[model samples]
Target: PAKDVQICPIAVDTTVFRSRTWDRLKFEIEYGLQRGTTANSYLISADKIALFDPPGESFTDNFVGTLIQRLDLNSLDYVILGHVNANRAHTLKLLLSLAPQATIICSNPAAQNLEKLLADAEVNNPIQVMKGNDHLDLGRGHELTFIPTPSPRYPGQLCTYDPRTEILFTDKLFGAHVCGDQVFDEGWTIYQEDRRYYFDCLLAPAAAQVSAALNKLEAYPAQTYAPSHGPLVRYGLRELTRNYQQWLSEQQAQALNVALIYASAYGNTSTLAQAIARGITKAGVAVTAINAETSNAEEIKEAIGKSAGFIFGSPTLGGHAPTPIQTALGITLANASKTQLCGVFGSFGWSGEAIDMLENKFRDAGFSFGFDTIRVKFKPTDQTLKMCEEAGTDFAQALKKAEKRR
Candidate 1:
């Protein structure tokens, strides 16, 4: 039997629908709550039919079938994507095949990524690129205003709003990873724990971008928040928005912080970076973990400039870090203070030339080390992760003592 998935009419005023699944989707660290999560996709079947942010291939078998059961694919006019990634490529391709007539709406960066994700597909659909000040009217009263909300993890992220229903399609913002029978946020207080924890794991690291995104959302007079995951926000829209601001304020108030930048080819380096960041966070120092692939040079420069320290991680064997990671390194070298403590770490198969190169460059620039350069050969064991956590604590303490001496 397929995993339990269902769809319901969300807006009483307009013909908008929500496709949801209450299954414990892959238990990544982000789903530390261990509660089953929902992959929510919205459909505004007004004058024109528009689908927003479909689930990944994990639910492809059920999601598309359920979607087809509710609406005719040929009448689908638009597929508004919040973001694009490889994981969601297959289902996207399948959807395009069935609804080849539908126009895919996304940001320029998301459009650019489509070449890599959907290039091999037999179906090629027309794409409409959305930017600031763009709006899509679905006849009747469902007019959508698209807003770009780029973060370190999702450069091409976007959100949508429907003024007729006062509903906002928030994409990845204001999401909790827990799934429940309650589709909307009726008793909103009950979800506080899951939502706050989700924010800590996902949004806290990219605080600057998140703050910018939230500010963009402030202009919308929304009565409901439709995030991509978990329950819908109908009852606690204002409360949740202010809570997000409060969380970000606390993060900003942290004086001592570290800019952690990394590119993980296979996620080993990412795991290590996460552990290290956890340790730093445990020490009460703020940590902004940035993905070099999704962040621009300006963002990296600013993050390092305001940081007490910075750590760089990547993958290496014969080649060095990714081009973006290298670019971030160059930006750090130019804009970052030499007084800011530096760290270098990565995973290598046979050799660690790139890791060594990172250390040498920082040393040549007169930057001191917060911890010894770490070079893991392959997948890190529990012991290796523990050492990385300890190193992170050591780095945070080092920054504190160095501040004292200064």
Candidate 2:
């Protein structure tokens, strides 16, 4: 096994595990971006021994072994789940096995999800649900306040603030996927690209939710942000936090907008969406990418209503478009004007009927085509992505040309 775990104390009663992996690649938005990942977990040795956000099942054996070395499992009081994921469910089950007496503390939805996730494993631990700004006292003046910060991708997301230590354990709010030994953000300038990429991939689609989360977290007087990934936010906390606010505002303040909507079954289609968005952004137009699976009809309608044009993308699933995309298309037809331009693109395994279907639907509805429909087979090669970017640029230029003519 590739051993890259580093354990260090961040405060008097706090210990953090900088769980690192070098070769592990993420398939969230794209195929692979080689920066690796870090799952930061914490231990609070107050009167009640509590753990926060354990690494997923991939690191279950190694991480559990490390935890066992630090404390007695029977005395472990709580496992605070900041967010729920299928990948982390296995680690949680193993933790419950070791500390059967420990209660799982999480938001209400997360508590419900945990029951279902651990049902097959038969975990019999008590689960405490935090309802609307609750605080848990770990003794020794350690008042940990819990804040619910739900996003479309992580509906049950929670953040914790330890007033005694002035550390905010932000699980998914301000995290990067890069793995390194620097526990605190000392040379943070080097991580700008990775941090922005991480935000765009995960947070951009849910800008309003992220903005609301930032507002909720503003109440905490935190000196350090112990995020679930990458380095802790100590030195660059103010700058990084400001950057998030600025980025969100920029998304909201763009002069011209394009509704970039799509569903990616295996991430290939979303990769195309990202490339197109980058190109459109470079041309001084905003791209609001809405994941069809995560976005509701109102969200899609709002995006279409505010945009000068729209792009429809889908991955061929069972020779048809996903149901979410079908729903989004209906919203687009009702909200978007026939004068506005539209583009079609998609990635498919074999048959690319989804792209053809979307293109025909828009054309038959009298929507002007900005560019020819783009179809990529399987994963997009660098050249294919370049073509997609060019297509996006053409779409933006066409929108501008139409505006000038009007």
Candidate 3:
């Protein structure tokens, strides 16, 4: 079956390519929910032609072909990258090849990634990094302001605002991973589940970061939010932004908290963390999951201080845990109380000594186990995930019991 790529104009001189995918893409954190996705890429043809946030390699050919039909590639002046990732490198390479004169506009960190990504490529495009609140003149009343919103998943993420159109080009923030023909969020009620799920899977883990990003976005007064995925936030812009704040508050206000720390080499460990978090939340407990690779020591200590207990998750790499996981383990031992409840879980291809080491360390430190240590070979099956969820619920129940005892 073929999916149509809808290219429609959202604002004056601004068009979005809604690249539809009927199947879930692997890169997304919540792909297991199986809602499919839409990569919303924006094009502005003012005095200078520019594109913002292209889809990954999956839609490279279709996106590039459709874009060429509407705008002249040779006259394209800039390609603004909101986030940097290995999956989107192919599309960036293709865009650079098509528009030889186009400059890459991004934050300082994103510029570094772009430099490495295009180092071996044939094209040599200049990169203009945005520091602080920088504005670019696209002529014809199109003055753009750039704001950097860094999160654990996208540390180099940047947002663009065009005063002429009053459209805020928010790449990852306030985005739903769903595909539909409707451009704007007219029937916003129907998308509440998908939007909430997206936020829980990605944003909830870094609630503080999300709140900070939302605060930064307040300076840009825009009527419409042109996010990089799903429907554009036009009809439900106010409600959606408020919902983000409310959701963050709710996560922070939960009584019993569980600190879920994990480092994923192939995302399997993260999947397990999500399942466990779901179970904990279902049992009326708050769970704060932090990716060890991205979280700093201060953040790790803060989470542990607030948590009733903590769970450690890891992926087996080279017959041991990753360096980030080791660092996290050291932090847990030094900062966490010996009476704190601990759980160990991991995914592995071969031997699972990492899980064993974690279990043994916690036992030796006189820490109590919330659930039996879990280890899955390869990817976890549906039954395995169900068991993991049940374990989480049991852990929450145990925490309540322990609270009463205290």
Candidate 4:
């Protein structure tokens, strides 16, 4: 029964996987901004049975439950790993515990990465590693080819291809996002932007490596694209390929632009940021202001990636802006190797070192402070607002004036 090859994609987490797939299941994990996290697993049946990717240990119940509901969990002969990230492959051991006869297959680098991660857990284990362009037979003429691709996002990333079906199982090489049942886009919101952010912010400095890997995939005959997060992309190879190309192209062409992000408790810092944005925009240079707490991490990362300058505003929250802002900033800074210039601003009711700490950290992160940092006292009055506005103007002028050197 050549036509009997079943391509079943079971949705594991409502927050992560979409409903359009063959099966909609649920797993437990708090991911990004809400009760959001899931290890998307797929069951591809051909001549042999293969389970692609698995949830983390935290999702043991959901993973086991879904697999049991679909078919004989113990009969799975192959585990096709999309990547070896903890959240994606942590449950491999658990699956092996249930089905000891199953074999775990992943890219050579990913296999090494998995061993390292497992070592940290003080667990020594042996798993088979597939080399670049390596192929494995899964009985009944079902075979998978492992394409080793270096992902700046994850060094040991791998993609699986079933040339017989023209399907490609790519991991986070494509971006994954949040939404309701309205997911899995053939176009419009393929989350290329989200992917860019995920890659650049989570995996920068090594971006050149990811670019090369993506280019390699462009040559494969891929139709169905599945990854670690989000619904399967039925027609994503061309789209994702184009996205990677454009992303790398833009980064190459980019120079000095500025991103002005702020977190305000009582709107004081927000006001200052707006004034700065106005001044920057008035000078005819691209400037964007974002509310750190409200803005998406992916968006913020993209902004930071494109911009040459950074303006951070914070109004003391428990003596500093929310910890989430710090989290976002730290992640972005860690990924970004260099920033052209930085402007720091904060509002404090009494004695707080939010501004000083931020400025020092920004400098340490390899950014040149443009001017003296600005701090606003309790509820900036009209005169103080004027000063803030003037500061913004000065900052914009400085950036404009610096262009001559370029």
* Candidate number of the best lDDT: 3
Task: Provide the TM-score for each candidate, comma-separated.
Answer: 0.88, 0.81, 0.88, 0.56
Against the true structure, candidate 2 reaches a TM-score of 0.81
Question: How far out, in Å, is residue 357 in model 4?
Answer: 16
lDDT of 1 by residue, 58-97 (tens): 7787788877887899999999999878777778988988
lDDT of 2 at 223: 91
Ten residues in sequence with the least summed lDDT for candidate 1: 12-21
- Please identify model 2 stretches exceeding 4 Å from their true place: 1-3, 27-33, 108-127, 263-279, 313-322, 344-357, 369-406
lDDT at residue 203 of model 3 (Cα atoms): 75
What lDDT tens digits, residue by residue, belong to model 4 across residues 181-242?
Answer: 43454565545555554444332323445667777777777776776665566655566667
**TM-score of model 3 vs. true structure:** 0.88
- The CA-based lDDT of model 3 is what? 0.84
Error of 2 at 52 (Å): 2.3
Cα RMSD for candidates in order: 3.1, 3.8, 2.8, 11.5
Q: How do the residues 1-406 of candidate 2 rate in per-residue lDDT, one tens digit apiece?
A: 3746789999979999878886554434322465777888999989998999889877888899888888899999999998986678889888889899999899976777677777778789998988657989999878889998876557678899999999999997788887776888887678888788777666765677899999989998999999988899888899899999998898777678888888831268877887777667667677777878766788888888888999998998899999999989998998899988899999988899999899999999999898899988987777776788788889989888888787
Q: Provide the clashing-pair count of each candidate structure.
A: 0, 0, 0, 4
Q: Candidate 1, after superposition: displacement of residue 230 in Å? A: 0.7
- By lDDT rank, best first, the candidates go 3, 2, 1, 4
Q: Which ranges in model 4 have alpha carbons more than 4 Å from their true place?
A: 1-38, 120-125, 182-206, 235-237, 256-406
- Overall local distance difference test of candidate 2: 0.83
